[model samples]
Target: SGPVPSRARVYTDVNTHRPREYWDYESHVVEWGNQDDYQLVRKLGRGKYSEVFEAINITNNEKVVVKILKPVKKKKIKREIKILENLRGGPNIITLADIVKDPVSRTPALVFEHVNNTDFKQLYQTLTDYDIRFYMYEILKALDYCHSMGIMHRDVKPHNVMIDHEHRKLRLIDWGLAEFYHPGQEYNVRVASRYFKGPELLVDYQMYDYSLDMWSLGCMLASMIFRKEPFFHGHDNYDQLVRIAKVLGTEDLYDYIDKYNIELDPRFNDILGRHSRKRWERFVHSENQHLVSPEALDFLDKLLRYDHQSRLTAREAMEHPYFYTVVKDQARMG
Candidate 1:
């Protein structure tokens, strides 16, 4: 529907310190239909784009994550790999060990270092506030790195983030929506996970840079801290946007209309504007009464703000005194 992606405009060599590492950057070179040595062991999880699997590396007997897409279009396959390669390696970021063809299914597969089923979501469910604080601190560290790299993990949900159980470290995964703003390369479009999608995306969908990712991060943090999704979701995007407004109590759609001067379609009239804070508190209180943390709610409050620009960057979030204060308190208590 759009221009066929040029040979992955962003990639491995963008590394200020490295030479050309194809897997690190060029999504174009990664084959989707090719099957070679990637051995699949068990089905992991499925998303709209691909089904993830736990696989073993034939070269070495190590567990790896493999994602498979059936009859995959070349463009999407390339896009996902491109997202991974750009982010590269980190404790907080999913380490992509190898790229191979799904040896069994002939589908596109991304091999990742097998983490022993450590995810913040599960951790949140079973752990105490202290554990939440510890895990979130790790999350912030990794998130800070990615943000500094100018990369955005648009899908900042609990599931997409994983942890290395052995190391007790956090990692971000599923780069299906991760993107880069290369030097002089500007993106003027909307792309991301729905629940984490920010104000800019919903209102303009065309002006997003990287703050949208921060918005998602804020949502994820709120969800983890409060144990609830920051926004209401539904079977469709329209309902999702309406849910966002119903919660925010302010509307920026007109900002888009006035800025770009796009004619307002009556079709979206129902979704226009924000829901008053009073109304939102009532709605959320009725459903997710547990979301009362001042820190978590305070962050969510700013994240749910109408203008996407109102969101905090990863650096700002990590450096903010709120996290530091909590982190210091934990240290003092420890």
Candidate 2:
């Protein structure tokens, strides 16, 4: 065991304040809606857990999304449903309209409000500096709300965040990996995808908290500002840490591991070599120079720290000078 246990910097008691029934998902029963009410219009995409489709509500002829889950443990399905129900109406959180299961085959599906989203690879290419700030601010609203309610979105990446650029709406989707936060709980580090996995996950530090999302968000922001698909382009999970260490430096990583009394994975011994921390300014070039600024770099530095507790909380991130314009505009609109 580590000599010191790390806790979330904010909203650590949220789940403790709620009723046992609220966070208890294993005992919750699923109230399945009629499957015939919606028809799959076309294949949209698929994930490890579910297959998604564009669909139409037969009764109202309105467009919707149908996410048909692959056969998985019953407990997981219940947890996703419970989290969705709890976060309903929270800012930028995806709305779960209905749940249905095929009676004979027992295939389950989740129905959601349709969002006309352009792929982020294309969308990020066209986004101006202001657009990035606005959308990133919107993402914080959802993250802050979920954390305040005592949930950690284990997966936070571009593919999961849907943006309807036409109407400037964003929805944070794919809550299948989200988990309720309990102090001192050792969670599964096998949570976020490879490119977006935080240092804690890579180092096998299982007691990580909500700050994990901020690290993922930092990676996403780094990609956007640097014009890279993934700023850390690691081929495998072990290499992922190497890739990050090359940028953040191997020295600071040791300091982090020492602070938490974490034992480095043996595999890293051969692959990780000492490298000085690269200045964030070095990422700026003619193409991304416009997106790079002192405020943006400062914010990125805070979020990408190896020490999870030192990362900016979702609420604190919104107050950073990098979001000044977006926050001011939001106030003006109201």
Candidate 3:
């Protein structure tokens, strides 16, 4: 609340140009589909807010995903549905097939197109250099499309990205945390997972935009190329910034906070210490050498910046030299 920061570098007025009804979810009424139309196959996983399962459509016998939301405010449910509907048909974005609710219990569930995904832990180990480039470019397509449509995906991590490697299909899932961008708006800093949280979030700078997703994407790519499960393995939210400062350096963090006039939480004062920035090249080794090209390091450096405004946009990232092979292959196929 010190000084109002500048607007986003790109797509600043997308929501302004669109109709108010398009972005207004609370006023829109939901038409829930028949819950009996789908049968549950098995439990896939569970989050704090919902239980996910694999299901089959009884009419067509097609596989689909059913996310049964736990008890939450009606406003929260409406927001997720509206965002998913708004982003439908964009490249690599998950398709929401239907919405259903248990009549008696009033439990809501979102049905989505099924993806035969292999766990990233196992799948990442088998990816060749070309495969990593191909999938990463695919993710950027989804990110760019969403950003262009004025939505910011707050949760972008390996688990949220579903990859069916056999079919070379990728879908950016879990839009529950996504929100429509409005310039000069102050958002909740407690959005992204701890490991992927940007410095802006760690320093309690609430005026973030779509670039938050880019920071998360950079963290994902760093983990892939470095063979580290999570590049910044923080024990909690406070430690997350400490982990980032250790690598990006404490001096840059101070510069960023000063630029925005951001006052960091006092807890950081006790735990934080001065650290020199570490070189990206130091992470390279025999196991990950194939993935750690000069172009890769350059792209990563541009993305993992202390200042969120300085990071690459999704469209700009897609055009980076790191994806030269992926882009060339696409043109050849056409």
Candidate 4:
């Protein structure tokens, strides 16, 4: 409680009026379903949190994704399920089909809509400028939809963004780290992968809102434009912020820290140093120029700002001139 109020660049307190149930994870009651209804088709992937598989429903012969939970807190499990139910039927969100537990071991599993996603490492490079513009815009729609509902996707890296390019489909997955936005509340900064974390997270600013997602989106867009997989590759968490400073500069980092009264960890003392901001143009080369434009560069500049409040909201970003070209491609590609 100080004279200044902490807020996002935009969409501040938009979720304040939302139903209390929308943000309350502890109160979530799991409506468990039958585990016998589906059978595994193939193994898909595994992460620290869950094991994923391609599955088929016995009743309808439909394909789905089965995510089997690892041992974790009951609250965390509830939060993932609750958020999906809250955003059900929203655009581009993974559809929650059922929540079932293994009859014997009582291990809970989540069934979601299947997306035929090829690896982004392969797909993003093959995409044309038009393809990049179209898909990024599509991703913005998903981000905007979720933010509007008061959800901040703490994880926004490309691995979490599924691209089924043949059908021009994109979906945002992995809601385990996501949390509801509460005005003036402090949140954990130890979210999002190292490469995609915002400066606010690096500096340990806790009152961050949905704009945290905008920063991660900027990191993704930057890598796409420059053809650097995981642009701002940090050797570790501390190095992540250092890598960002090499690009965004150290001067602005100080101003941003001071404005919010943020305290940098003692670990940053030795590593932090003066560095001028690197111009986006410096990264441009012949291979990627087709994807680079004045508008594209300008749009990225706004999103990558160290000041979280200065970044554009998802709705505001949709109006960027970079996407204006997408409207022209729409009819012709059709």
- lDDT by residue (241-319, candidate 4, tens digit) is 9999888899999888888777778899889788998899999999999888888899999899998889999999998
Clashing pairs in 4: none
Q: Under the 3 Å rule for N, CA and C atoms, how many clashes does model 4 have?
A: 0
lDDT digits (tens) for residues 207-302 of candidate 1: 355566666766666565545644456445566667666555444545534554444446667654545544334434533345344555555566
List runs of model 2 lying over 4 Å from the truth: 1-3, 103-105
lDDT of 2 by residue, 42-81 (tens): 9987777888999999999999999998999999999999
Estimate candidate 4's RMSD in Å: 2.2
Candidate 3: residue 88 Cα off by (Å):
0.6
Q: By TM-score, is 2 or 4 better? A: 2
Residue 317's lDDT in candidate 2:
95
Clashes of each: 5, 0, 0, 0
Q: Candidate 3 lDDT, tens digit per residue, 163-253?
A: 9999999999999999999999999988988899888888878889999999999999999998887899999989989999899999998
- Model 1: how far residue 166 lies from native, Å: 7.8
Model 3: CA > 4 A from native: 103-105, 332-334
Q: Stretches of candidate 1 above 4 Å error?
A: 1-38, 118-122, 164-167, 182-190, 251-263, 271-274, 279-292, 325-334
